[PDB]
Amino acid sequence: SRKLILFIVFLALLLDNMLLTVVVPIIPSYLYSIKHENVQVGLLFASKATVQLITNPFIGLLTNRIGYPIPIFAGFCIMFVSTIMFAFSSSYAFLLIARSLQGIGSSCSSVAGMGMLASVYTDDEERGNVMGIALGGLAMGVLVGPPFGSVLYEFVGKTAPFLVLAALVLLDGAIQLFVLQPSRVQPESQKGTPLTTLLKDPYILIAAGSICFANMGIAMLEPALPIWMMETMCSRKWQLGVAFLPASISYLIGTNIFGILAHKMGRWLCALLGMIIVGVSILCIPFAKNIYGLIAPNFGVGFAIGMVDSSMMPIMGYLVDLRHVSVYGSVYAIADVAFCMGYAIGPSAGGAIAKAIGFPWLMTIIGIIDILFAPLCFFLRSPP
Numbered sequence: 001s002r003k004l005i006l007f008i009v010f011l012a013l014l015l016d017n018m019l020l021t022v023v024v025p026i027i028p029s030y031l032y033s034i035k036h037e038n039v040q041v042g043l044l045f046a047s048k049a050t051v052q053l054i055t056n057p058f059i060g061l062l063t064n065r066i067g068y069p070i071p072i073f074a075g076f077c078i079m080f081v082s083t084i085m086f087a088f089s090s091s092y093a094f095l096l097i098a099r100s101l102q103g104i105g106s107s108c109s110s111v112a113g114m115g116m117l118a119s120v121y122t123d124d125e126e127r128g129n130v131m132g133i134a135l136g137g138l139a140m141g142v143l144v145g146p147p148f149g150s151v152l153y154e155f156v157g158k159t160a161p162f163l164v165l166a167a168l169v170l171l172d173g174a175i176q177l178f179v180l181q182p183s184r185v186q187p188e189s190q191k192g193t194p195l196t197t198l199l200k201d202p203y204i205l206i207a208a209g210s211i212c213f214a215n216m217g218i219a220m221l222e223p224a225l226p227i228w229m230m231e232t233m234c235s236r237k238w239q240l241g242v243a244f245l246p247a248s249i250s251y252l253i254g255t256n257i258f259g260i261l262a263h264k265m266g267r268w269l270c271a272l273l274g275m276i277i278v279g280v281s282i283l284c285i286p287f288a289k290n291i292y293g294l295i296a297p298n299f300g301v302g303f304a305i306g307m308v309d310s311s312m313m314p315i316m317g318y319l320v321d322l323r324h325v326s327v328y329g330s331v332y333a334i335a336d337v338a339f340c341m342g343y344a345i346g347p348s349a350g351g352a353i354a355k356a357i358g359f360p361w362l363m364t365i366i367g368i369i370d371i372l373f374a375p376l377c378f379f380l381r382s383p384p
């Protein structure tokens with residue numbers, strides 16, 4: 001009965017991404033009103049992703065000393081605290097602190113949950129399936145966040161989305177306490193291989209780079225696309241919001257189905273095809289003239305990112321099992337660092353490049369990089 005661990009990881013990722021995507025619509029207007037009585041949003045997101053990026057190696061090393069359950073419960077506690085502060089804080093410094101705490105909790109939950117899933121599902125196929133489900137939960141939380149927040153804001157109040165999220169967080173924490181039971185400290189049997197040896201592995205580097213570039217695609221998509229839309233198509237705000245819906249839906253479907261299909265098609269082949277597809281979709285994005293012209297490339301981008309994630313995340317554990325000690329804190333900390341590497345420079349830089357050179361040139365460069373990195377996944381195939 002280890003499906004409870006999968007449910008806990010699923011819930012943690014879902015609620016974390018739900019908070020990360022639900023805070024967005026409300027705070028900036030209140031910040032502007034407070035200042036009186038676009039860029040700072042990207043600064044908030046960069047802060048959260050950067051704090052998650054810094055914490056990842058530390059949590060990876062910590063999971064080898066105190067085990068997984070205590071980091072998971074700590075992630076839950078920090079995530080609850082950040083949700084409460086989001087509910088009650090109205091200034092900018094407190095909201096920045098809330099974002100940083102949410103980043104720490106994101107690092108804890110993601111790294112420890114992936115490590116626990118890898119350590120529990122030792123089969124190479126079941127591992128792929130369960131982390132495909134976990135990434136599908138991440139995508140589900142991303143997709144549900146904004147509609148849930150808008151509905152609760154219109155129905156009850158501004159604090160309602162965060163209070164309901166905090167109630168769900170308390171339910172998840174009660175489940176964790178009942179199942180995980182982080183009463184004592186349980187060190188792992190074998191000392192983990194240091195990251196200095198892990199970053200020296202070309203295959204782990206290749207998988208991490210594939211994840212990093214695949215996520216960098218959408219990471220620089222998010223803040224630069226609305227400006228280009230308003231400049232060329234003069235599109236409306238609802239059209240801007242709808243634009244990323246195909247990406248989220250395709251990401252959810254891709255994660256859920258390719259967590260299973262990667263082991264059938266071949267993880268290396270799935271990653272190569274995903275990189276090619278995301279490169280082609282990003283190349284085709286600038287040529288669109290209407291939102292209907294971006295419905296298909298966004299779907300391709302989401303599907304390809306789901307392919308790459310749900311293929312490379314299992315391959316990380318497979319590689320660390322094959323050529324390293326069977327401990328998954330450090331390698332999945334590396335994978336989280338790969339995620340945050342794109343998600344942290346996205347908001348901060350994407351605008352800068354989209355202003356220095358044209359948005360079509362930026363997206364052409366990103367797509368060319370992804371296409372050229374696609375053949376590097378050829379080296380991740382198994383000899384037998």
Ligand SMILES: O=C(c1ccc(F)cc1)C1CCN(CCn2c(=O)[nH]c3ccccc3c2=O)CC1
Binds near residue numbers: 045222244251
């Ligand atoms: O949509 C997504 C997605 C994922 C995979 C996939 F394949 C297809 C789509 C998710 C949606 C949440 N974001 C992170 C949240 N976030 C920022 O981090 N920075 C921003 C800067 C400016 C404006 C908004 C944002 C913003 O929402 C991460 C990716």
